[PDB]
Amino acid sequence: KVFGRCELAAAMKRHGLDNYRGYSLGNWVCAAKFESNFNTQATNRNTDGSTDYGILQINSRWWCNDGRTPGSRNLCNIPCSALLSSDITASVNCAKKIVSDGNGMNAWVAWRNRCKGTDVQAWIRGCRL
Ligand SMILES: [Cl-]
Ligand SMILES: [Cl-]
Ligand SMILES: [Yb+3]
Ligand SMILES: [Yb+3]
Ligand SMILES: [Yb+3]
């Protein structure tokens, strides 16, 4: 599923990401924009042999199981395919664990490089919330 901006903001709010670990909704929408372009089916292979999955590009080394990533810990206890679903619940549940792991949203390199410090409120402009 390719979400619209405000559609994704609404879904993230419904699943309790708004201000989760102190990160406002626009931070999450911005992260998703640059990780996946709002596409739940996004997959990308990393240089270390792991793969990133879904709207927030969650990796298969630490977080989910894809069966082809040696050293897989699967800390979200979920097949990586579950992170590609049109329903964002599994991605949100796993993102909550990731952002709680110590470094906040810096876990997402794209967030650090493209969202952090910017006017992230723009990502929720005009949305009914
Ligand atoms: Cl915001
Ligand atoms: Cl933090
Ligand atoms: Yb990646
Ligand atoms: Yb559902
Ligand atoms: Yb409201």
Q: What is the resolution of this structure in A?
A: 1.4
Experimental method: X-ray
Please report which residue ranges of 37-103 form alpha helices under DSSP H. 89-99
Tell whether 101 is in a known binding site.
yes
Phi, psi for 21 (deg, rounded to 5): 55, 30
Distance 78 CA to ligand 4 centre (A): 16
Question: Is the separation of the CB atoms in 17 and 120 below 8 Å?
Answer: no
Q: Measured in angstroms, how far is the CA atom of residue 90 from the centroid of ligand 2?
A: 22
52 is catalytic: yes
In the chain, where the domains are located: 1-129
Q: How far is the CA of 7 from the centre of ligand 4 (A)?
A: 15
Q: By the 8 A CB rule, do 49 and 43 touch?
A: no
Alpha helices in the chain (DSSP H): 5-14, 25-36, 89-99, 109-110
Three-state DSSP class for residue 52: strand
**What CATH number was assigned to the domain covering residues 1-129?**
1.10.530.10
Catalytic residue of the set 7, 48, 52, 119? 52
